[PDB]
C-alpha cells in the first residue's frame, strides 16, 4: 500500500497524477508521519516549467536532492524507483542497471516509461530530465547512472547524520545508539538501553565517514551474513579484529574500532566481549 | 535557577566546577529538555589538555562552536556570559564591551575573572583561550570581540535554520510558521494555525539570509517598537511597504516581502491586510 503513503507525503497532484516534491520523498524516507501539506497547488500547470527552471542548477554530487528542496517532478513510479535503489548495495548496482535493457540508454530511455507502464499492468520527470536531457537526449551509461546511485544513497544517508547529531559535524556515541535502535527496531528491549546507559561512556563522537561507511555496510548486509555462516553454525562469538577483517572482505568498506567497540559494548549483553550470531545478527533480523 | 538547568545539560564536572561541553550549550539554547548525559567523565583531568588540543583548529568565523562539537571548556559563568550576548542587538554590542573596563583587554583580562567573581558574591576557558591566548595573552579589542559576538549569534541562529528546514538549504513557508510560533509562544491560539492552514499556500521557500536577517531583526526588537509608538497610539494598522521602511530604519536590516507578506498573511487575522499594533506587537509581548 506504498501508493497510499505516497499520497500522504505528496501535495502536488494533476488529475490524480500526484507529483512528489523532492522534499516529500526525503521526508518520506527520513520522517515517518507528516501531514502539514494542505495543498493541491500544482494544478496551475506551472509544473511544466517549475522543475525545468530549477533543475538547471542541480548539484550532480551528493546534493542532487539537497539542491532543489521541494521543487521537482517526482512521479509515483520514480518514487518506487528510488526505493529500490535505496537498498541496492554495490553488487546489485551493475545488475540494477543490467536489469534494464543494458544496451545503452538508447534501449533504456523507454525503460523509464517501461518502469511506468509496469505499474499500469499491475494496477518530464526530474530524473528523466537529468537522465535524458529534455525529450530523451542524454545517454546515461552505467557509470554515469552509478554516480547518481551512490550519491543519492549518500545523500539520504548524509541528511540522516545531521538529524541525529542535530546538525553538528560530530555525533555523540550515545546518539549513534538510537540510529542502530531505529535500525534494529528492538528498542523496546530496555536491556540494550540498560546496556548503553552504563556500559557506554558519554564521551567523544563519530564523524560522517565512520557513520556513512557503517550505513553503507548495512547496504551489503547479506554478503556479510553469508561470510558469517561458518561462524554462526559454529556459534563461536566473534572478536573485534575478527569482525573487522570479516566486514572488510564482506562489504569492502573498512570501519573504525570507535564504532564497533560501542557496537560490541551495546550488543555484547552476554558480557564475553564477543558477538555471537544471535547477538548481532539475531536482532538485525527483527525487521 | 538557570544554574540548575546548567547542571542538567552539562555532563563534565570537577569538584562541583561543572564544565559545559560546546554542544550542551548549543543544545541548551536549541533544545529545551535533554537528559542523555549519564557522565561525570572529566574527572580524569584530561580537560587541561582536552580543550587546548582541539581549540587549535577552531573556525574563527560563524563556526566557532560548529567546529569543536562537544569538546571545550565552558564554565557556568561563561555560560551566562553567552546568554547575555545572545540577546544583544548591534546597539548594545559596543556598550556590552563598554560595560567592561573599556580600557583595552589589559583592563578587561581580569574582567573575565571579575565576571566569575561576580557570581561568587551573589551566590583556562575556551573563550579565554581564544580571548587571551594561553595565560592572559591576546588583546581582544572591541572589533575583534565584536567579531566573536555576531558570528556566535549567527551560529546559534544558523543551526536553528537547519533544525526546522531539516537540513535543506530552503525552509518551506509553512516551516517558518512554527519558528515564529515558537517565538511568539501564542501557539495554543489555533486561529493562527487556522490562519496558516488556509491563508498560507504551501509553495516556495525562504533562504538563510532572509531568515537570519529576520532573526537579527528580533534582536533589535525594542528600537523597532519605539519607532512604532506614534503608529500604535494612532492604532492605524501598517502596510507592507510602510512596515519595510519601518524595520529598515529600525534595525538597519532590510527584509524580503516573501517573509513579511506571510507574516502579514499569518498575523492579519482582522483581514484588512494591515498589521495593527495589537496584531503583531501584541502577541510578541506574550513572552
Curated annotation (Swiss-Prot), chains A, B:
EF-hand domains 1 and 4 have high affinity for calcium and act as sensors of mitochondrial matrix calcium levels. EF-hand domains 2 and 3 are degenerate. It comes from the Eukaryota. This is Calcium uptake protein 2, mitochondrial. GO terms for molecular function: calcium channel regulator activity; calcium ion binding; calcium ion sensor activity; protein heterodimerization activity. Heterodimer; disulfide-linked; heterodimerizes with MICU1. Component of the uniplex complex, composed of MCU, EMRE/SMDT1, MICU1 and MICU2 in a 4:4:1:1 stoichiometry. The lineage of its organism: Eukaryota, Metazoa, Chordata, Craniata, Vertebrata. GO terms for cellular component: calcium channel complex; mitochondrial inner membrane; mitochondrial intermembrane space; mitochondrion; uniplex complex. Residues 88-123, 124-155, 186-221, 255-287 form the EF-hand domain. Changing residue 88 to A: Does not affect interaction with MICU1. It comes from Homo sapiens. Belongs to the MICU1 family. MICU2 subfamily. The keyword Protease does not apply.
Amino acid at each position: 500500500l506504498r501508493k497510499q503513503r505516497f499520497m500522504q507525503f505528496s501535495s502536488l497532484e494533476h488529475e490524480g497524477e500526484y507529483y512528489m516534491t523532492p522534499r516529500d520523498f526525503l521526508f518520506s524516507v527520513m520522517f515517518e508521519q507528516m501531514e502539514r501539506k494542505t495543498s493541491v497547488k500544482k494544478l496551475t500547470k506551472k509544473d511544466i516549467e517549475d522543475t525545468l527552471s530549477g533543475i538547471q542548477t542541480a548539484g550532480c554530487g551528493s546534493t542532487f536532492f539537497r539542491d532543489l528542496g521541494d521543487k521537482g517532478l517526482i512521479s509515483y513510479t520514480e518514487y518506487l524507483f528510488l526505493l529500490t535503489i535505496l537498498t541496492k548495495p554495490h553488487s546489485g548496482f551493475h545488475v540494477a542497471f543490467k536489469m534494464l535493457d543494458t544496451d545503452g540508454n538508447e534501449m533504456i530511455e523507454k525503460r523509464e516509461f517501461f518502469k511506468l507502464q509496469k505499474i499500469i499492468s499491475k494496477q518530464n520527470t526530474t530524473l528523466q530530465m537529468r537522465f535524458f536531457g529534455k525529450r530523451g537526449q542524454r545517454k546515461l551509461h552505467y557509470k554515469e547512472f552509478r554516480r547518481f546511485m551512490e550519491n543519492l544513497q549518500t545523500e539520504i544517508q548524509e541528511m540522516e547524520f545531521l538529524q541525529f547529531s542535530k546538525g553538528l559535524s560530530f555525533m555523540r556515541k550515545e546518539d549513534f545508539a538510537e540510529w542502530l535502535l531505529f535500525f534494529t527496531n528492538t528498542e523496546n528491549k530496555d536491556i540494550y538501553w540498560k546496556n548503553v546507559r552504563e556500559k557506554l561512556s558519554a564521551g567523544e563522537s563519530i564523524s560522517l565517514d565512520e557513520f556513512k561507511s557503517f550505513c553503507h555496510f548495512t547496504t551489503h548486509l547479506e554478503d556479510f551474513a553469508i561470510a558469517m555462516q561458518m561462524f554462526s553454525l559454529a556459534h563461536r562469538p566473534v572478536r573485534l579484529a575478527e569482525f573487522k577483517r570479516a566486514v572488510k572482505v564482506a562489504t569492502g568498506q573498512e570501519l573504525s574500532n570507535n564504532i564497533l567497540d560501542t557496537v560490541f559494548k551495546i550488543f555484547d549483553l552476554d558480557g564475553d566481549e564477543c558477538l555471537s550470531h544471535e547477538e548481532f545478527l539475531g536482532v538485525l533480523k527483527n525487521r
